[PDB]
Amino acid sequence: PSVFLFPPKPKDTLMISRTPEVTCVVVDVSHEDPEVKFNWYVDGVEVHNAKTKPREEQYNSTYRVVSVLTVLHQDWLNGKEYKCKVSNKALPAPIEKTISKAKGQPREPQVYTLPPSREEMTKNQVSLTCLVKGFYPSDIAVEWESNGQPENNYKTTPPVLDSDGSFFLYSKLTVDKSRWQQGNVFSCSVMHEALHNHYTQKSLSLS
C-alpha cells in the first residue's frame, strides 16, 4: 500500500476563521489485508483527533482510506512537522510520510498592477494584469474585486520559481473594454503569510 500526505489550502491556513486540514491518503489496500491503522504525530508527539473517513473501495481492485487531521494555525505557520503513519499487514515496516510548511524565511510579496497595453485596447475585451513577486513560500491566494464585489472572470498562473528562490505569478482579469473605459476601479487582492494582516490589496483604474 502507498501513502500520500497533502497540505491545507492556502486561505485555510491564513484566515483565523477557517479550518486547515492535512490529509493522508492510503491507496492500494488489498481485500485480503484490508486493515489500515493510522498514527499521527505533530513534531513526533502522537495525536488522536484525526477523523478517518468512511472507507471507500476504489473502482479497481483496491480501497483507498483517507485520514483528515485539523492543524492549528500557529503550528502550520511555524512549520511544525506532521507525520502520518499507516500500518497494514501487507507492508514490511509501517510507512511514514512527513509534510510541513516550506522551510526558510517568509518573504513579503510585492504586488503591482498593470493596465492593458494599447494594442489590446483595439479589441472587444481587455486584460487587467496583476504581478505578484518575491514571495516565499509559494502558498498564496489571489482574487479580483470591483466596487467591493467579487469579480470572477480571472485566471492566475501557478507560482513560478525565480532566481533568488522566491516565487512570482501573474493574474489576469478579463473585462469588456467598454467597462474599463469609464474608469471603474478594479482591485487585485493577495493573501500571503508574510503580509501584515495576511492580506494586501492594490488597484488600477483608467488614466
Place this chain on the structure above:
Amino acid sequence: GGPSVFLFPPKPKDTLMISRTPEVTCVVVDVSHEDPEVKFNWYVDGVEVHNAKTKPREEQYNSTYRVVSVLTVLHQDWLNGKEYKCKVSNKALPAPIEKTISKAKGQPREPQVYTLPPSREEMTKNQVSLTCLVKGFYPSDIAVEWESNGQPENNYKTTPPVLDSDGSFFLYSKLTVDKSRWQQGNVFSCSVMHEALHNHYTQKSLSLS
C-alpha cells in the same frame, strides 16, 4: 498486476525549432521477472515504421522492469497531426496494449502578444520587470524568449500555459533588468514561437515612453 504503458509527446521547443529533435517516448513499467520481454511496434498513421531506438530493460528500485522506446518524429509530420501508435506486447498481458498520440486536436489559434512595462510603483526599485502577455493561443505548445539589440536576454522566466475560459491558453513572461537600463530608452523584444503564427514566429518590442 500487469505492465502499464505511457506515451509522451515531444517537448514544446523541440517541435518548434528546426535545430531540435522532437521525439515520442513510449514507456512500459511494471514488467515482471517471469515475463520480462517487451516487444514494441510503431505505426505512423497506421503504417509500421522500423527505426525507433528501443532501450534495454532496466530494473527499478521497486523490483520491476522499465523498458522504453523512442521514435523520432518529423517536425512537419507532428505538426500536421499525424498519429503515433505504440503497440507493446508482453507475455503477462491478455493481448497487446496500444496507445496513440498526436498533436492537440482542437482548432489552432494565433497567439496575440502584448508587452507591458513596469508599474510606476515598481520604478522606485533597483530592478524592474518587463512583462510579456501571450494570450489566446492554441494548442499550448509555445516557446517565448527575450532579446536586446540583437542578443538573447537571459534573465527572463516564463509561466506555464494557463487554460483560459474560452479553451485557448495564455502565459506571461517576465524579464528583470536594471532600472537605469530601462531608463535611457533601450529597446527590449519579446519573441514568440507558435505553430499558428506566420513563419511560426512573431516579435514585439518594449521601449521607455
